[model samples]
Target: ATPSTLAELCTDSIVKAALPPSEFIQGITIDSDSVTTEVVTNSSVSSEFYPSATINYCNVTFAYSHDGIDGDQVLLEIWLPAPTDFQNRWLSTGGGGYAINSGDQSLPGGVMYGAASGMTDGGFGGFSNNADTAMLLANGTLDYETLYMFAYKAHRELSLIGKALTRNVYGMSDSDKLYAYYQGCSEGGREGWSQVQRFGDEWDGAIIGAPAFRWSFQQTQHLYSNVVEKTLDYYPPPCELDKIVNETIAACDAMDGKVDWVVARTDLCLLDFDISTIEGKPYSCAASRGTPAQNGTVSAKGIEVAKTIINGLHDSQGRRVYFSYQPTAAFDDAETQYNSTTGQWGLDIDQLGGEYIALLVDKNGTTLDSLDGVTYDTLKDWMISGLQEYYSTLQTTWPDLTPFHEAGGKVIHFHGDADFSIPTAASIRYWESVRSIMYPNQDYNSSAEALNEWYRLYTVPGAGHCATNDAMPNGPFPQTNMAVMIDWVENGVVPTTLNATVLQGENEGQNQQLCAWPLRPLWTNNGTTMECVYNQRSIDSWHYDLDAVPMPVY
Candidate 1:
């Protein structure tokens, strides 16, 4: 039979009974799985939404479920290219926010790039942010069965089931080994990091950007700006926040010795910058979003609010509780909202934060006004509680990657310095901690090359989160951040500087280069004379302590 016939034969009854169950079983009991195949056409995708070309692939859906005390249903879908198009590789795409894209979002793109690609609902299922309500039970306990599936189980099984099915459908033998790869940003990047840390041997290479790690910290940090506003009784208008951010960028934009809009050297920006310096600055703004402009002064209280935010969260004794946003990020990362109908202002807390806190953390019939008097210590208590609760099972902040290193896997971890949702500071913290734990003999800067041997970190100056922050819509982005790993893994092509284009901002369309972590980019005279130089400023600025607790041995 032809390849088309084999793909066409991918029906429920035939697939469930045909494949050897021994190859697919892991920790879970798979009661059954149904398969459906379709010829998908006239579709395309890029690492970013910029470029596109025609793509044709056979879309295969594997909807599976378990039969046990805790029954779970999962959808793991894969896109298979023609035999010629298949690269003998498996690529796993990632989920975003709180939901996994059950649809084949990045599948066809990877398939078009010559690899069979797949994604899973992580068992909770859907592209919706309702995991908080759906996963939490009425008795104040979580459905660990479905929760585990969402956290790591389904992701680990993603490769196992996907590879086995692909091999059987292609009529392959045990003699062949298929290369496995991963690519995802934001929460999807979280899935990628989990696999690398927990199941190191699973993937040969991965591209993770702005990973939503530090489960508890990531969730609770969203409440920072809100808490700041309420504590100071200062709710700065959106336009003022935007105006402050714009002027700050202008003041601190050239810290790296370049005039690019990105505040690439954040450590310098944070240290040298003082919100009070720009306090008396006057700026124009629309009073109610669409209305005409009005004269406004950068308020002293607004400046104080900005200071507290950029300073990040501090404990009662002034110690760092968590990393904060860089100056370039929109103060609106946790923006204050204005409701026209209700005629009220509020914090549009991040979905995962808002939901995780409301349903999973509080677990009470707590209303928005339940605790307006919550203090800094109180917020810290909740954050720490959430951290300890989920730290073992959910957080992916493990520093020692002895297993991943032993497996000889490779990773390209990139984060936007301007990212608001997840601070680039955490990225620095995670990477620095890895160095401290794994290469204890080597100092932070000294062991960077050693870490670069397996894991390389790139900090994009102007980009925000996985997408734009909307406030500062500027800078260069390297969507091919994923494709580059293919060469690095298969052919030993080390990326000296990540090649990208200034897709946004005044420098749009200009080809750009992003330096690996600890090294800042320097562009003077002609852009042709650009180079990545060792900057002690960043080294001193982003320094993190390794005295923190190690990940649990389990």
Candidate 2:
């Protein structure tokens, strides 16, 4: 059907399914002069005395497609609820947008869908429609390409078509009068940064958690690096990884004067544990063929293998780059020891490997020839090239947030410190870059301070990539409540504290705290609960592991 006809049909059905058109509502108007336009206006547009209430909610879905870099057609699902008051709008992108709008209330209900690795196609049985087709795509030999296209299409369609649908349903009286937000983790987190960098106006608030932003690099590095590490003879034993991490925390954790398990005092940490020391313990650390030498260190063969695994990938120019890394002694846990097949969470790495090679690498490897030389140059090129088409749709600088920030949009971003999948440092680097680009003035101490005000970032110390944490392995809740971000966007009250809780088995209990960025949670003499304090300099102090064999150059 033509765009116009699609809109009419959309209107005819008060409640439409996935991918609804927006032409249905044309020239709808809102009272511009109404109190709702004022930032501090305490008055309500269509309701009672309660500070927050749902005004209007229509079951609407907006669909649009954009041509990806590979010239593949990508689909987007934008479900917009009719505005009750002014506009309480939310957009989430993860897996596939359909999972969010599939009308399955078993999961938390929010306005947006979180964009997963490559829409919901990567994960089977998530969306109501296109399950079989997506599964087929999941089996295809174009993993990264599929995900890249899905990412680009999801963001583009949400902004372009979502806006059109919003205008039609609510009328465009106050274009800048609506509140917009985005919430996602892992792949979705990457898309969040992508939006701010390229599509600032798409959402006023974004909660980006554990972003695997550089997709190709992250996955490739994850696979190859683990293979190298696990094959090394000199690699530290399982317990050694924990001891090294604990040592780092011990040395650094007390910077704030209290020895909390959380490594909030990262700067003060000097992890002195040596990887070579714990070579012949009982624990099965690395599956190496070499033995310890007269010096009590693993054989020369072990060192060579370790070095290769630790730092082999490079560009054509011989410049060393990294996709990811386990801290000097990070993989010592016997249970979570390095698995060549699965890399991180023992999640069927071999199965994931096949998926990666076929779906992402777009190449099938039947024998050892599949494991060829992959350098940083190749990895970097692939990663950047994949994102070019996606980033092209969003803005690239912080100052560009003028369109959304000026319109009173609040964004919240958080990263898990213990994240093994993607380095937390990457998130910090990205956040810092955003601040530098947005506020070039050296007056705010660091770029973090500038971002702290408008854009808030919270780094959860013990939390793993997107899943586990030192304290809680699974998560406080089965499904992370990132949707609370909607409250911050619509209500204008930033969350000062997040109560970290976990429900393991049938028991539910509170765990720890998630401090706002640029601040470390300081333990007060009054109680055991940690409180957020804004002091980057204090948290900036540090010590390094002396035994850390210079992170191998090769």
Candidate 3:
């Protein structure tokens, strides 16, 4: 039976009981037009990033509060179809960098989610501000409680309330409630892992892309790169970086026995592309200048800077700080965007390092400028010590997933091998960490197989931080991730190879198969078909031990 109206149900005892005293439904509106209308009308949504899609649904906005943050309200919006269109499922999307509020309402599709088909067909979907706007009202005060709400608590509340609204709208009983799922990339990806680790029972399935899980270390890595570029006083121009990248690609792109632009195995690419040989050939140290390279050749100093960027940030003792960089494919697309006019790479250490020091580490609103009088060595010391101080609150490095696996939860983690901002190796290390914790003393093969029962990691070649880029033949990055997750959760069928497509660019309409982690896609029949083949050597090359500190399981 279909519910006649939602206004009466909003005040229902069950609805009131389901929410805390701090939370309440602010408003609900029925719309025949798609949630895309809200995006088209809202200026907050970037036209370049989000395209409007039409689908009929009801939009509900919820307002909530946190302790110690008086007068600061968090708003969550839930969009669902009519009772007839209900699919008995709910999808809660993740937010991006420093984004508490999700600008677009449509289910984020393309690479993040398979497609908005479920949303269009009457599945419930929504997002909240993640307490971003409310937290801003704290006026530079770092409140752990408010931070928790943004980190994971608010999303959990959104899922619970969204499901309640779904039941109310569809006239469904408690027995017929909806299954929950999540999709996010980057910070959103971290949010996905947070759900699996902290709130395992909440979601039946999740798809995370390039999760920013190691928060403290990752920020330090950013600072490490900045220090290298600043210390060298030589930010390689785009042309210089591109030249080196091209040479590396030429040497390693065919390592998979195919001339396809994709470096299917970055592990091999790193070994094959020797930085020493190319140092003086395409670019030389002598040609390096304090400014942009005018001769199109990188100076020796420039090469050192490039090496530091690729090799990753290191500590004072020469130990790797976080994770190594994705050597070849992500140079031009990383945080180090080149500016020819300024002859400096776009590595804004101040903003990134500043935020980490002020909010996450020091919690005293310390700006980068405030540390102007401090020596570089002293600053580096502070950076390293600060990361250790806030490791628990900032980093999500928990390795144990026994509860999640035992609960029959499914997680599909996909990362771009060429991801510049968040190294693909970080995700690989995290996966290996889980493998170690789950199957100690077991060989890699056995551990990976066991881990696949509940979790699967797919590394996308030629893809940037989160999506397709020009570094390789761009493809539909993880187009089938959500579909694989749904099948695994609803039908109990685990997927191995996901059929992918090159949506646009020179490789448009081209198709290839994406294999799960540890498995490389091998071209067959003269590059006609792709086959999944596991190479232990290649997989081992990606492994690294960061001696990561684990968080409390409970």
Candidate 4:
């Protein structure tokens, strides 16, 4: 076998190991350029290029039969774009969610393409394939050392290939003098953090929205919590979750001086309403044994499942499970909105935590089962302990960024106040950690120059997950142009305010002003609506409703 590149050889070896008899390599040369090809499917995977007005980007797609697993191959889709001459070079990364590479199986035109931004599907089809693989990637067990190679392969080599192809097709250097930058949300957000923490040198600037920072820890804890919710029958059904969420808005809606569904101020109100308060009332739950679904009523089964989910996964004795959840989103809707066949809720939970936990418990090797309260705690403890060990690989809590800050690696991160998946408070925690490191003195909050060099964390109200429509709209509605991050990195002018709007979709067709962090958007008697406000806060106040909801009591 003639080896062309190290990636090819690595692919060949893994294929041979997984399928011995079927291990055959096919090669073709185009004008002296030898490209080894493996047929996963008969169709040619097409990846296109989109030349930005300022930057050049090429999206490439190819088929590969990954060796470690059999009867499963991936159509790798990559978007490699040259950086803007004015901006720093970047290598954007994405986190785990089913197969990021594959289009959403549930949605029409689901396959992720170049026009959709850069993403990849790890060798398998769905979230199930993520199981141990996600764990490995999170903790640096499997992909840390070598997986960086794959990242380089995609971000660098494939990008260069695309650039060459674009040049051949367009007859000019579209983006020859620009730096690289990367940004993503959720799993993609995690990828952004990875670039800063692990591969900071390769990428210059980043925007991580609701990054599951220490994913292994987050996944394990989330999984155990779901199991407990399922066992105790506290899981919330879909419609109920929406109700709870909407109710949260209704109750807190006026605090922001608007009746719009968007809660412009989440921390303004205390979480006084509890699940037990609404119990026996019309509630929707998926697990309550005696609960009956009534028209427009939140089911009892939904409440039961939600109760279990909210309380069942914590280490009551205090082992620090590593993440937190609140039940307030269930005010108008259930807490867990996304439903699954196996009773799973969040994105890629079973794959990351479920399978890992299943492997640890029930050593006899079973698919699924319900666990008692104590048993769930046991699983939580084991998973947390294991994940901590994994984090050791990249756990550099470098509070002081004197070197990097001075060297110039700007990081701009924002989280939505209404984010249920990962709380926005976590981002606040990270920012505080940085502040504590930068300024040890009681009065010093770091110099403006120093703060300007390193990191900035912005918290957006009414936005869910990342920069959603309710918080900041870049296109169509109250467009803030989410791409502002690109200009910030390139032009070195950090954004102080962004305009947010609701468009003709999920949280669409409305308009709002999204204030920059440390500067809350406040009304100035111009109008009574959200748009009447501008980013300005006279005094920093932490007095706003700050109640630590005890990790629900089962």
Query: Which runs of model 1 end up more than 4 angstroms from their true locations?
Result: 1-23, 26-33, 47-51, 125-130, 287-295, 339-351, 364-371, 468-474, 505-509, 526-528, 544-554
Candidate 2 lDDT over 379-446, as tens digits, reads 54554453453234221222346555665666666666656556555565455556666678776456
Which candidate number would show the highest TM-score if scored against the true structure? 1
Return the TM-score for each candidate structure.
Answer: 0.90, 0.61, 0.80, 0.61
lDDT of 3 by residue, 1-554 (tens): 34443333333342333333333433322222221212111123211123323344444444444444444444555554434445677777766665533455325332122121121111112233333333333555666656666566667666666666555555667787466788778877887787787776777888888987777666655555566666666666556666677677777777766777777777888766676556665543233454433454556776687777777655556654455567665453233544668655555444555666666655555345543433335444554575566445446667888888887888888888778778888888888888888799898789889998778888887788777767676544665555566677877777776556675687776656678887877777776777778777777778654323233211
Give the root-mean-square deviation of each candidate in angstroms: 3.4, 10.7, 6.6, 10.2
TM-score, structure 3 vs. true: 0.80
The lDDT leader among the candidates is 1
Q: Give me the displacement of residue 371 in model 3, in angstroms.
A: 7.7
Give the lDDT ranking, best first: 1, 3, 2, 4
Regions of model 2 farther than 4 Å from truth: 1-12, 16-87, 96-107, 111-148, 159-177, 230-267, 270-320, 323-369, 372-407, 441-447, 470-487, 495-508, 524-554
Instruction: State residue 82's C-alpha deviation in candidate 3, in Å.
Output: 2.8
Determine which window of 10 residues in candidate 2 has minimal summed lDDT: 32-41
Clash totals in order? 0, 43, 7, 65
